[PDB]
Each structure stands twice: as structure tokens, then as C-alpha cells.
Amino acid sequence: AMATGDERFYAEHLMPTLQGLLDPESAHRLAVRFTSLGLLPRARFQDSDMLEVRVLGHKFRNPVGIAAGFDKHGEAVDGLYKMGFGFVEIGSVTPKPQEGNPRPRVFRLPEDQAVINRYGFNSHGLSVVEHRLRARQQKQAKLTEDGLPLGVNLGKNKTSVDAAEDYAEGVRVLGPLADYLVVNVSSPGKAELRRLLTKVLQERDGLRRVHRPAVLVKIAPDLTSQDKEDIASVVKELGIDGLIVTNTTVSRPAGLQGALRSETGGLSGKPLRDLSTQTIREMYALTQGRVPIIGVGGVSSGQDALEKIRAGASLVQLYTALTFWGPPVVGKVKRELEALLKEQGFGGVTDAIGADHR
Ligand SMILES: CCn1c(CO)nn(-c2nc(O[C@@H](C)C(F)(F)F)c(C(=O)Nc3c(C)cnc(OC)c3Cl)cc2F)c1=O
Ligand SMILES: Cc1cc2nc3c(=O)[nH]c(=O)nc-3n(C[C@H](O)[C@H](O)[C@H](O)COP(=O)(O)O)c2cc1C
Numbered sequence: 433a434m435a436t437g438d439e440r441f442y443a444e445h446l447m448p449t450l451q452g453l454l455d456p457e458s459a460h461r462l463a464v465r466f467t468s469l470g471l472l473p474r475a476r477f478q479d480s481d482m483l484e485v486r487v488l489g490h491k492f493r494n495p496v497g498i499a500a501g502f503d504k505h506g507e508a509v510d511g512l513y514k515m516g517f518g519f520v521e522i523g524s525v526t527p528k529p530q531e532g533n534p535r536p537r538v539f540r541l542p543e544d545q546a547v548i549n550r551y552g553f554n555s556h557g558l559s560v561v562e563h564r565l566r567a568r569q570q571k572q573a574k575l576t577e578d579g580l581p582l583g584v585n586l587g588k589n590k591t592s593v594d595a596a597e598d599y600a601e602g603v604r605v606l607g608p609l610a611d612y613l614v615v616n617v618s619s620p621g622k623a624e625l626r627r628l629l630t631k632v633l634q635e636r637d638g639l640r641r642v643h644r645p646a647v648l649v650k651i652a653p654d655l656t657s658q659d660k661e662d663i664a665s666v667v668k669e670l671g672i673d674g675l676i677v678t679n680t681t682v683s684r685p686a687g688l689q690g691a692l693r694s695e696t697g698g699l700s701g702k703p704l705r706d707l708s709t710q711t712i713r714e715m716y717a718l719t720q721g722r723v724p725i726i727g728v729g730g731v732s733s734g735q736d737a738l739e740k741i742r743a744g745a746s747l748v749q750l751y752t753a754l755t756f757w758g759p760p761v762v763g764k765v766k767r768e769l770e771a772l773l774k775e776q777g778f779g780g781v782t783d784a785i786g787a788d789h790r
């Protein structure tokens with residue numbers, strides 16, 4: 433096809449050329465800028481009804497989202513929908529502005545189709561992002577109505593003594609502008625998690641009904657069996673709306689070839705894929721298939737997307753694949769997912785959710 437040819441040109445020539453000419457943070461910064469200005473093709477992949485998912489109190493036109501980290505400050509939301517993402521997650525956004533870690537803090541492992549990052553939650557802050565989303569609030573209301581929801585990932589400041597209050601601040605400021613909110617959880621213990629999430633949910637429940645977002649918990653793949661058992665219990669107990677599975681890994685799987693493999697940070701991309709899919713599988717089973725999962729980590733194809741869906745994910749996200757494949761990856765994943773769904777006898781995405789477990 434014309435799509436596969438375009439996909440090959442970006443993957444084989446354009447992206448390796450551009451990534452050779454730019455440091456990885458400049459590449460990211462330019463990507464946000466080009467996307468913010470809408471410098472993209474119109475829309476050759478019109479989304480099939482097969483790709484539609486209804487979850488988290490919302491229509492999703494397709495299940496392929498852009499993961500948190502690409503658009504930390506909500507600068508490129510409209511361009512991301514133009515790129516063909518069925519939903520956009522912005523952030524992480526911290527309460528106060530902060531610079532994050534010293535540069536260099538992003539590293540490419542092209543031999544592994546992986547990235548390492550240690551951004552350290554660089555953020556323009558809730559106030560800047562609030563006013564930025566307010567400027568396009570009604571445009572977003574229509575987009576959400578048309579099946580294109582907006583998520584916001586809420587972080588905390590580096591020097592914060594009270595993590596729960598930073599997240600609470602985020603619920604109050606950005607919850608009215610979001611379809612869903614995300615709080616990242618690291619390794620717990622169980623009572624501390626219950627306390628934090630209770631406060632987050634209380635703050636969410638205090639917003640007016642019309643501006644009341646879903647609340648999701650995002651987990652790393654590096655948790656113990658007991659951490660995962662505890663998270664599942666608390667999430668079911670409190671009525672947490674969903675799980676995002678997973679963040680980057682602090683592990684370094686055997687077989688990484690990139691020179692920069694020993695850089696401190698979170699590893700993303702292909703080496704994360706099956707660690708992430710197995711975490712989805714575990715969390716789906718520990719929650720009895722009753723907590724919607726957003727599957728993320730190493731999605732670069734329809735097969736990768738479908739494996740996460742069959743393992744228990746209602747929706748997927750990607751980021752790292754975009755750095756190697758460019759904008760055509762979104763259409764690629766969607767086309768390939770649709771084809772595989774047909775090949776496996778599923779009417780749509782919804783039928784495939786948790787199919788491995790049945
Ligand atoms: C992890 C940090 N990180 C890295 C490094 O690891 N790369 N990266 C990305 N870089 C991108 O392009 C650069 C090479 C750019 F300099 F060209 F901006 C894009 C991207 O989509 N670029 C675009 C757009 C938007 C429109 N039109 C295009 O071509 C006609 C292209 Cl190539 C997406 C990314 F996630 C990124 O976030
Ligand atoms: C450069 C970079 C920055 C990221 N920043 C964030 C962030 O601020 N908050 C967050 O929850 N996840 C962040 N992530 C994690 C991604 O959202 C995603 O969970 C992870 O990269 C796995 O997906 P992928 O393999 O498709 O990239 C970041 C990832 C990368 C590569």
C-alpha cells in the first residue's frame with residue numbers, strides 16, 4: 433500500500449536521518465512544536481466502527497492513545513488527534529513548575545528499538561497547563577463528544593513532603609478540564625496507598641457532576657507480586673476507575689545492545705513489551721476483569737496492541753514507537769489491529785478484551 437510505503441520511508445530513512453542530526457531532547461521538543469502547529473497529513477485512515485471502545489464513562493473512536501510524556505505540558509493535544517490517536521494523555525503535570533533533571537536526560541537505543549529517559553517530571557506547572565487547556569476547553573468538549581477523550585497525568589513536585597496533597601491540587605485544578613486523571617504509583621504500605629487514593633477520589637467526587645473525571649492508577653512493571661496483589665485489592669475496594677499498565681522499567685533486560693544501556697532512567701520500547709503485557713495479564717486476573725486497563729509498553733504493531741488487549745487491556749497507548757517510526761505508526765497500528773481482529777473472528781476491539789483469560 434501507499435501507507436506501508438510511507439511507513440517504510442519514515443522508519444527506514446526519515447527518522448534515522450532526523451535522529452542522527454538531533455540530540456534526543458531537541459527531537460522531542462521539535463516534535464511537540466510541529467505537532468502543536470498541526471504540521472501533519474489530513475486523515476487517510478478513517479477509523480472503523482470495529483475500533484470503537486466504550487469505557488471509563490466515554491466513547492473512544494479508536495483504542496490507540498498517546499502515552500504520557502510526549503506532551504507533558506498540553507501543548508500539542510489537537511495535533512495528536514490529527515495524527516490519529518483515539519485519545520491523548522498529557523502530563524505528567526506537577527503543582528509548581530520545575531525544571532526536572534540536568535541534561536542530557538533522554539537516550540536512544542536504536543539497536544533495541546528502546547529509549548531510556550530520566551526527565552525527572554519537568555513541568556510547566558498546573559497553572560500554565562490549566563490556562564492552556566482553558567483556551568481550547570470548548571474545542572475539547574466537542575472532541576470528547578466525538579469520541580476523542582483527554583487524559584491528564586498528575587505528578588508531584590520533587591521536594592513535596594505531602595504526595596497526596598500535590599495530587600489533590602492536581603484533581604482540583606485540572607480534573608474539571610480532563611476526561612480522566614492518572615496518578616502514578618511506585619512500590620508500596622497498602623494502608624499508605626489506600627490513604628492517598630481515598631484523598632484523590634474524595635477530591636474528584638467534590639467536583640460538579642458535569643466536570644467529574646475518571647481516576648486511574650498507573651503502575652511500573654517493577655512491582656513485587658505482593659505490591660500487585662495489594663494494588664488490585666485497594667483499587668477494587670475504593671472503586672478506582674482503571675489501571676494504566678505500565679510505565680517504564682528501571683530493569684535492564686538481558687540482551688540490550690545499545691551503547692547507552694547503562695544510563696540511569698526508565699527503559700521504554702520493544703524490550704519493555706512482554707514485561708508490560710504480562711503485568712496487564714496479572715492485573716486483569718487479580719481484579720477479575722472488572723477494572724479497565726490501559727495497556728502500554730512496547731506497542732509498535734497491531735499484534736503488539738492485540739496481545740495487550742487479549743491479555744486484558746481495553747485501550748492501548750504508545751510513545752517510544754513514534755520516535756523510531758514517526759506519525760505513520762498510528763495508522764499502522766490501527767490498520768494492523770483491525771486486520772488481526774477480523775482474522776481472529778472478533779466483531780470489534782470490545783470482544784477481544786481479556787480473550788486469553790476465557
Ligand atoms: C523520547 C524523545 N523523543 C525522541 C528521541 O528519542 N524522538 N521523539 C520524537 N521525534 C519526532 O520527530 C523528530 C525527529 C523531529 F525532530 F522531526 F521533530 C516525532 C515526530 O512525530 N516527528 C514528526 C512530526 C511531528 C511531523 N512530521 C514529521 O515528518 C514529516 C515528523 Cl518526523 C515524534 C517523537 F516522539 C521524541 O519524542
Ligand atoms: C521520554 C519519555 C517521557 C515520559 N514521561 C512520562 C510522564 O511524565 N508520566 C508518565 O506517567 N509516564 C511517562 N512516560 C512513560 C510512558 O507514558 C509509557 O508508559 C512508557 O514509555 C511505555 O510505553 P512505550 O514503550 O510505548 O514508550 C515517559 C516515557 C518516555 C519514553
Ligand SMILES: O=C(O)c1cc(=O)[nH]c(=O)[nH]1
Binds near residue numbers: 501551554616679
Ligand atoms: O519525567 C520522567 O522522568 C518520567 C516520568 C514517568 O512517569 N515515567 C518516565 O519514564 N519518566
